[PDB]
Amino acid sequence: RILTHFYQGIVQQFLVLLTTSTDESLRFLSFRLDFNEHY
Amino acid sequence: ILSTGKYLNVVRECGHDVTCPDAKEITYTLKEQAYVERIEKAYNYASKVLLDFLMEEEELVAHLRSIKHYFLMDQGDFFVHFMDLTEEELKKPVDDIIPTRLEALLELALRMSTANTDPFKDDLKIEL
Amino acid sequence: PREIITLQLGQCGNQIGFEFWKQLCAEHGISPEGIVEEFATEGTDRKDVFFYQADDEHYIPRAVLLDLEPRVIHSILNSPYANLYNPENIYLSEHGGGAGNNWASGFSQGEKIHEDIFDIIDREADGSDSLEGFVLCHSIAGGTGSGLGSYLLERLNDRYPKKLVQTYSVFPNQDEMSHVVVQPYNSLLTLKRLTQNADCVVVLDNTALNRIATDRLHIQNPSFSQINQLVSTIMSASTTTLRYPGYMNNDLIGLIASLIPTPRLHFLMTGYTPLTTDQSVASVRKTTVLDVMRRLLQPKNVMVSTGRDRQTNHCYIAILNIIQGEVDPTQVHKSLQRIRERKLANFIPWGPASIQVALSRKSPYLPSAHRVSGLMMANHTNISSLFERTCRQYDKLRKREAFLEQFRKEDIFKDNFDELDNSREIVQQLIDEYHA
Numbered sequence: 344r345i346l347t348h349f350y351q352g353i354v355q356q357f358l359v360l361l362t363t364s365t366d367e368s369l370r371f372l373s374f375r376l377d378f379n380e381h382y
Numbered sequence: 383i384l385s386t387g388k389y390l391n392v393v394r395e396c397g398h399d400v401t402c403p404d405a406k407e408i409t410y411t412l413k414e415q416a417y418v419e420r421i422e423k424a425y426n427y428a429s430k431v432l433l434d435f436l437m438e439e440e441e442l443v444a445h446l447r448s449i450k451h452y453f454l455m456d457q458g459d460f461f462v463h464f465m466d467l468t469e470e471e472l473k474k475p476v477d478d479i480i481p482t483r484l485e486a487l488l489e490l491a492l493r494m495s496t497a498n499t500d501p502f503k504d505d506l507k508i509e510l
Numbered sequence: 511p512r513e514i515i516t517l518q519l520g521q522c523g524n525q526i527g528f529e530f531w532k533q534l535c536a537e538h539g540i541s542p543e544g545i546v547e548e549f550a551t552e553g554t555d556r557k558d559v560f561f562y563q564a565d566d567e568h569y570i571p572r573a574v575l576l577d578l579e580p581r582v583i584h585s586i587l588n589s590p591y592a593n594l595y596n597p598e599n600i601y602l603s604e605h606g607g608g609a610g611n612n613w614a615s616g617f618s619q620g621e622k623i624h625e626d627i628f629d630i631i632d633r634e635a636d637g638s639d640s641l642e643g644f645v646l647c648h649s650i651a652g653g654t655g656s657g658l659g660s661y662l663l664e665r666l667n668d669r670y671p672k673k674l675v676q677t678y679s680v681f682p683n684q685d686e687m688s689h690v691v692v693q694p695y696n697s698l699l700t701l702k703r704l705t706q707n708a709d710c711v712v713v714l715d716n717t718a719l720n721r722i723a724t725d726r727l728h729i730q731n732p733s734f735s736q737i738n739q740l741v742s743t744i745m746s747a748s749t750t751t752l753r754y755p756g757y758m759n760n761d762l763i764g765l766i767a768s769l770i771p772t773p774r775l776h777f778l779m780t781g782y783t784p785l786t787t788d789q790s791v792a793s794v795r796k797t798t799v800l801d802v803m804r805r806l807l808q809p810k811n812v813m814v815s816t817g818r819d820r821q822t823n824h825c826y827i828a829i830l831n832i833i834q835g836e837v838d839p840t841q842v843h844k845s846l847q848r849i850r851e852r853k854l855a856n857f858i859p860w861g862p863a864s865i866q867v868a869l870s871r872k873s874p875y876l877p878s879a880h881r882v883s884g885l886m887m888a889n890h891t892n893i894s895s896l897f898e899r900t901c902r903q904y905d906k907l908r909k910r911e912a913f914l915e916q917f918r919k920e921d922i923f924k925d926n927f928d929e930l931d932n933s934r935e936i937v938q939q940l941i942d943e944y945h946a
Contacts, residue, residue, distance in 0.1 A: 362478040370510060374482015458757040459556055463511065466640070494511065495755075496555055 354380070383421060389428040396435065403427065448502040463491040476510060484508050512559050512752070512761055513638040515631070517662065518575045519648040520655020522680055522737075524582045527647045529742040531571050532591050534560065534753075537746065537873035540569065542594035553874035555755040562637065574600050574631050578607030578616065578654045599630065613696035614920045616657025628665075635670075642762060643674030646708075651682035651716070656696040663707040674763050676710040678745060681896075683716035684903070694904045695913060698930045701900070705937060710766050710776040712748075714741065715896070718813045726786050740813075744782050747885040750834050756870040768866060769828040769889055771944065774937050777893045781811035781886030793881050799838055799845050803831050803867075806886045807854040815899075816892045825945050826855035829865050830887035835872035835879055842867060860946045891945065894938045901934055 358380075362373050393400055403424060409417050436442040455461055467487045471480065485508050497503050518527035535542055538557055539549035545567050550557065561569035571594065577583065583605065586592045597603065608615050620627065635641055644666060649655030666675070682693055704711050723729060723736050746753070751760045759765045770776050783805060805811065807829070809818070833842065849855075849865050857863040872878040908914070908927065 358478075370478070370481050372482070373478020373480075374484070375479060377477055377479020378483045378486075379479075455757060457555065457755045458760060459755050462760065496551065496557075498552065498555065 386421065386425040386428065389425055389432055392432055393428070393435065400428070400431070444499070444502065448499070457495070459495040460491055460497070463494050464488065467491070481508055481510060511638060511640060512642050513562075513572060513640075514560060514642045514762060515634055515644055516560070516571075516573050517631075517644055517646040517648065518573055519646065519659050519662075520577055521579050521582055521652055522649035523647050523655050523659075524575050524577055525734075526678075526680065526738055526741045526745075527573065527575070528586060528591075529738045530647075530745045531573065531594070533742045533746050535591070535594070537875065537878065538569075539874065542591045549874050554753075556753060559753055560749065562634070568594075570594075570596060570599075572634055574634075576600070576627075576658070578610045578619075578658075580606050599634070611653050611692075612920075613653045613657040613692065613699060614917070614922065615653060616659075617661060618921050620658055620661035627662075628669075641670075641673055643676070644670065645762075646675070646677040646679070648677065649680055649682075650697050650700055651680065651693070652690070653692060653696050656700045660700050660703045663703040667707055674766070675708050676712070676762065676766055677704070677708065678712045678714065678741075678748075679704070680714040680741070681716055684899070685717065692913060692917075694900065694907050695917065697900060698904055698934065702930050702933055705774040705776075705933070709773070710770060710778070712780065713777050713814060713893075713896075714780070715813055715815050717815050722785075722811075722813070740782070740785070744780060744885060747782065747832065747834065747883065748887070750832065750870045750872070750885075751868060754870045754872070756868065759866075759868060765830070765887070768864070769830060769887060771827050771889070772940075775889075775941060775944065777889075779886070779888035779890055779893070780813045781806050781884075781888065782813075783811045783884050784881060790877070790881060796838075797882060799833060799841055799882065800848070802833065802882050802884045803845050804848070806831055806884055807888075811886065812888075814893065814896065816890075816895045820892050820895060821856065821890075824856065824890060824892040825858045825863075826888065826890050827858050827861075827863060827944075828889040829855055829863075830885075831865065831867045832885035832887070833867065833869050834883040834885065836882065837869045839869065842869065858945050891941050894941050897934060897938050901931065901938075904931070 358376060361376060362369070390400055404420075411417070452460075464487060467490075471483065471487075476484075488506060488508065492500070492503060516527060516530075518524050532542075538554055539547040541547075557569060558564070560572065562572050563569075573595070575583065583601075586595070587603075608619065646659060646662065648659040663675075666673075682690075682697060684693070687693065719737060719740065720732050722740060723732060727736065729736065748765070749762075750756070751758075751765065752762060759768060769778060783802070809816075809821075846865060846867055855863065855865070872883070
């Protein structure tokens with residue numbers, strides 16, 4: 344119960360903190376991680 | 383003569399191959415209006431060797447065929463496969479992981495409907 | 511993607527689907543046992559819409575063929591087009607059936623081979639994760655195609671509820687009643703299942719076949735070897751937007767959606783003019799598209815026995831005019847210009863009508879890329895004349911005490927005869943009510 348609460352906090356923080364840098368090919372990188380968690 | 387220099391610079395961008403059709407160009411003669419008409423038959427020939435270079439390597443007609451009526455929509459079997467995948471995804475604006483999937487679905491819808499020339503259809507990009 | 515499973519069934523339904531698959535190899539540029547021509551991918555841009563998708567560039571047909579009579583399948587394996595068919599998808603060698611001639615035979619045989627009939631035909635369903643639907647390529651004539659075909663119209667309605675159902679069913683012949691006499695009984699039992707247990711049909715009359723078979727074909731003794739020639743071309747003609755690359759109504763749920771006004775009104779009139787080979791010597795002079803659709807609405811190519819003086823109080827609602835191959839599309843709007851001036855189609859006074867025209871490029875072949883072809887899919891409200899013809903031959907037979915004691919011994923305990931009569935009159939009354 345302590346481990347899966349950490350993993351749930353990791354998977355949510357991995358989405359937002361990947362989607363902020365200065366307008367390079369990150370739109371390609373932000374395309375890929377939402378495709379993995381949902382499909 | 384301005385448009386003459388524009389077409390000879392296009393072929394010069396490929397390589398240094400053109401020569402003026404006479405061995406020596408003279409305008410210091412009392413006839414001068416028949417010499418700008420042999421200047422106009424010269425840039426017509428520069429158009430013809432540019433029209434050459436369109437028809438040999440570049441395929442302007444195949445480029446306009448691969449874009450335009452296909453861009454309105456010509457062969458919808460490329461697009462109704464992609465329209466199956468506009469009904470599952472395109473309900474909300476794009477997220478950060480969505481445009482990575484949209485190019486994956488365009489290339490999926492390429493070969494399920496059997497494109498005839500693949501380097502003419504990999505030039506499609508996707509607006510955010 | 512858009513995979514359709516054809517359900518070839520009966521004595522006549524198996525033969526009309528045998529040359530339907532044989533027609534498809536000549537236009538795809540493929541052989542039933544090999545690939546010898548390169549015209550299959552450069553000329554044809556889509557092939558995996560009726561065939562199964564390839565494992566060795568061998569496009570397997572997505573077909574099943576069941577019949578009580580083994581005579582129709584024993585004339586198949588000696589032909590060189592049967593190696594394209596598989597001996598494990600439907601049956602292996604020495605397949606049989608009943609004795610057998612009854613509507614109650616195949617209606618009772620569906621629940622005793624219920625385990626096997628829903629086992630091997632469902633293996634082709636999960637091959638594609640987006641199934642189009644089912645077409646029942648069955649027959650109405652005889653008790654073989656009409657007895658077992660009424661069972662699958664019920665159990666596939668709920669096990670596969672989100673799939674299109676629409677059939678190319680052939681109507682039986684009503685000239686004399688000596689060889690068969692059970693024709694009014696087995697036809698109306700399937701015709702009830704074709705309206706409420708089925709969405710759409712494509713009618714194909716038998717008395718209208720020999721009207722065309724002696725029109726331009728010039729035969730003296732009518733044989734069964736001519737019934738497959740008019741039928742197999744218009745089957746492949748109906749999927750030209752679906753097989754060949756088209757844009758609008760390129761699916762089978764595209765074409766049928768734009769023509770059906772309402773459920774239990776789905777009987778579509780078919781027309782197809784070009785069937786003569788000596789027309790080929792004069793199509794070299796640019797024969798246009800302006801003359802090919804003037805004769806479609808003119809009742810000459812029709813395959814429906816209807817009244818000639820009953821078209822003034824009846825109105826067209828939906829009419830399809832399919833041109834194929836060379837169209838010269840700079841004058842296809844010019845052909846539709848001349849439609850409003852004649853008013854050859856009577857229009858419904860309550861709502862709008864529609865003359866839909868579409869085109870698709872044909873096969874890279876010399877009899878196909880030279881001669882204009884016109885496929886008609888009409889919908890006219892004079893189709894109750896066939897329903898008045900079948901019902902008047904139905905109630906007259908029940909007053910002669912014909913097949914009331916010879917038909918209710920097996921699996922029939924109550925009188926379901928007026929259950930078919932009122933539902934047929936419901937169709938005939940709602941057709942005339944539909945134009946207010």
